Design a protein around this ligand. Structure first.
Ligand SMILES: CC(C)(C)c1ccc(C(=O)Nc2cn3cc(-c4cn[nH]c4)ccc3n2)cn1
Length: 355
C-alpha cells in the first residue's frame, strides 16, 4: 500500500535505498521492475499512479554526496531541455518528475524500449539497414543540434545511450543453425543519459566520453565543446552501419594511430599544443608497425572509405557525412546545423522528418 510503503525507508551500508519490486515512493510511484544499475544507484520501472498508472523509468541515486551533487546538475540540464521543447519534438528524454527521497535524488522519465546497442547485440551484431542508419542519423543530428543551441554538450553519446521509443522487431529470416535476422519496426529514437551533460559556462571534466566515441581533442587535452558530440555521432553511425566499433582499442596512443590510419594525418598544430607529448617523437606518433598490436592495427584499420558495403550514391553520401563528423580539428568539424543540410538526408521520406 502506497502511504505505508513510502514512509518505511532505510539505506544499505553503501548508500543505496533498500527497496524491492512492490515498494512505493512519494505515495505515487509503484516499483514494478528493474531496468539497470550502476555505481550511481539504480533505475527501476514504476507505475505512476498520479498519472494514470503510466510507465516510467525512475533513476534512484545513491545517498552519497558526490552522486547527489552530480544528479542535481543532471536535473538542471533536464529542466532546460524540458523548458525549451514544449512540443516534445527534439528527441531528448523529457524528465517527467524529480524529487529528493530521503537523500536519494530521483528522476522520472517516460519509459522507452531497448537501447540501440542492446538491439544490435540481439541481432548478432548484424548492422542496421542503410535507411535505418539514415533515419537514426537524422534524429541524432536534430536532437543534438537542439542541445547545442542551448549551450549544452552531452559528452557521452554512445549506442547504449540512444533508446528506441519502441524496440519491437520484425523477423527477416530465421534459418536452421543460424541467428535470427531482425529489423526494428519503428526507428524513432530518444537521446538519454544527461548525467555527463555540461553547460558552456560550467567546469568541463577533462576526460569525457566512452573510449570508442572519444574525440582527439579530448585525448590530447586541448579543450572540448559541442564538436565533441559530433565526433561521437560519427563513431555511432559507423557502428550502426557495420555493427562493430570504428575504434576497437583501450589505449590513447594506439587510438590516435588508428585515427591516423583511418582518417589521415593529425594536424600539426594539435600535436604542437598537446601536453601529451609522450605519444609523439619529432611530430609523429610513436608506433611499432611490426608488433602484435602493430599487425592488428595494420590489418584491421584501413582508410574510412574502404568500409563501405555498397558503392551506390546513398552509401557514398553517408561516408561523406561521416568523414565530416570525424574531422580531427574540432574547429573544422561539421556542425549539426550543417549536417542536417547534408545531401545524405535527401533520401528521407516526408514522414521520417516528422518528430
Ligand atoms: C520490454 C523490454 C524490451 C525488455 C524493455 C522495456 C524497457 C526497457 C528500458 O530499459 N527502458 C528504459 C530505460 N530508460 C532509461 C532512461 C534514462 C534517461 N536518462 N537516464 C536514463 C529513460 C527512459 C528509459 N526507458 C528495456 N527493455
Amino acid at each position: 500500500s502506497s502511504k505505508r510503503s513510502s514512509r518505511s525507508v532505510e539505506d544499505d551500508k553503501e548508500g543505496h535505498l533498500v527497496c524491492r519490486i512492490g515498494d512505493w515512493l512519494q505515495e505515487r510511484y509503484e516499483i514494478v521492475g528493474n531496468l539497470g544499475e550502476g555505481t550511481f544507484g539504480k533505475v527501476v520501472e514504476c507505475l505512476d499512479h498520479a498519472r494514470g498508472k503510466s510507465q516510467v523509468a525512475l533513476k534512484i541515486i545513491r545517498n552519497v554526496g558526490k552522486y547527489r551533487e552530480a544528479a542535481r546538475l543532471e536535473i538542471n540540464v533536464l529542466k532546460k531541455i524540458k523548458e525549451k521543447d514544449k512540443e516534445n519534438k527534439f528527441l531528448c528524454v523529457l524528465m517527467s518528475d524529480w524529487f529528493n527521497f530521503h537523500g536519494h535524488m530521483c528522476i522520472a522519465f517516460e519509459l522507452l524500449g531497448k537501447n540501440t546497442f542492446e538491439f544490435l547485440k540481439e541481432n548478432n551484431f548484424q548492422p542496421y539497414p542503410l535507411p535505418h542508419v539514415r533515419h537514426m542519423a537524422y534524429q541524432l543530428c536534430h536532437a543534438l543540434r537542439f542541445l547545442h543551441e542551448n549551450q549544452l554538450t552531452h559528452t557521452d553519446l554512445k549506442p547504449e545511450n540512444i533508446l528506441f521509443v519502441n524496440s519491437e522487431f520484425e523477423t527477416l529470416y530465421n534459418e536452421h543453425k543460424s541467428c535470427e535476422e531482425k529489423s526494428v519496426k519503428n526507428t524513432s529514437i530518444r537521446v538519454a543519459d544527461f548525467g555527463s551533460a555540461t553547460f558552456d559556462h560550467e567546469h568541463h571534466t577533462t576526460i569525457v566520453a566512452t573510449r570508442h566515441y572519444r574525440p582527439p581533442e579530448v585525448i590530447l587535452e586541448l579543450g572540448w565543446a559541442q564538436p565533441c558530440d559530433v565526433w561521437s555521432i560519427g563513431c555511432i553511425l559507423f557502428e550502426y552501419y557495420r555493427g562493430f566499433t570504428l575504434f576497437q582499442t583501450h589505449e590513447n596512443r594506439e587510438h590516435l594511430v588508428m585515427m591516423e590510419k583511418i582518417l589521415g594525418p593529425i594536424p600539426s598544430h594539435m600535436i604542437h599544443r598537446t601536453r601529451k607529448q609522450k605519444y609523439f617523437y619529432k611530430g609523429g606518433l610513436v608506433w611499432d608497425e611490426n608488433s602484435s598490436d602493430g599487425r592488428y592495427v595494420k590489418e584491421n584499420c584501413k582508410p574510412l572509405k574502404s568500409y563501405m558495403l555498397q558503392d551506390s550514391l546513398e552509401h557514398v553520401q553517408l561516408f561523406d557525412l561521416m568523414r565530416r563528423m570525424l574531422e580531427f580539428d574540432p574547429a573544422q568539424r561539421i556542425t549539426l546545423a550543417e549536417a542536417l543540410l547534408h545531401p545524405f538526408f535527401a533520401g528521407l521520406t516526408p514522414e521520417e522528418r516528422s518528430f
